[PDB]
Design a protein around this nucleic acid. Structure first.
Length: 101
DNA sequence: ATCAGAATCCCGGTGCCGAGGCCGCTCAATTGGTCGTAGACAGCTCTAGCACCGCTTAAACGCACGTACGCGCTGTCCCCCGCGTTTTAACCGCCAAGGGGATTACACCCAAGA
């Protein structure tokens, strides 16, 4: 992790890939790549959640912040389409035909 | 246009259990070395993909006319929209079923074992 400049563990990812019964041999660049991708995804999600929390005057990330960060982003909603977030709720979307005319 | 009215958001205020910081190891991560096979690279090939022509024809577009599905407007009465009353989902103290100490007054005498 220190040689690749990543916060996610490289040895743990390598051990998980070796014990997960995915392939006979595992290279040295695949765990680094997977850890980097996971770290980038986590960083994007956490930044969006922190922005949503700052928009609500909150200092702690709650599942509602994660839901608002995932649903507002198009790519994050496409990647997590069939993903359900517990205690996250939904978006405050009201149809125009239901408003008082 | 205009007001009275219940419903909603932000601020003193507070404290507490969840969020956050620190210590000891020890089992997983790291270093160093010896096998070693799956991976990278060069070579032959012919089959598979690609571009183009000859002859053919049913498919696709413009024309003609109305109409019936498409859609605005109307008469109705309906069954949800919404408030008032407890109640049903559980939460919270005294009866009449029994288990036990206590008694057979008071004072005196005789006989026979450890």
């Amino acid at each position: 992790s220190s040689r690749a400049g990543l916060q996610f563990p490289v040895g743990r990812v390598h051990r998980l890939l070796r014990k997960g019964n995915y392939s006979e041999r595992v290279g040295a660049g695949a765990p680094v790549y997977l850890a980097a991708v996971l770290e980038y995804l986590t960083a994007e999600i956490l930044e969006l959640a922190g922005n949503a929390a700052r928009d609500n005057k909150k200092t702690r990330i709650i599942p509602r912040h994660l839901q608002l960060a995932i649903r507002n982003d198009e790519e994050l909603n496409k990647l997590l389409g069939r993903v359900t977030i517990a205690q996250g709720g939904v978006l405050p979307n009201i149809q125009a035909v239901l408003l008082p005319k």
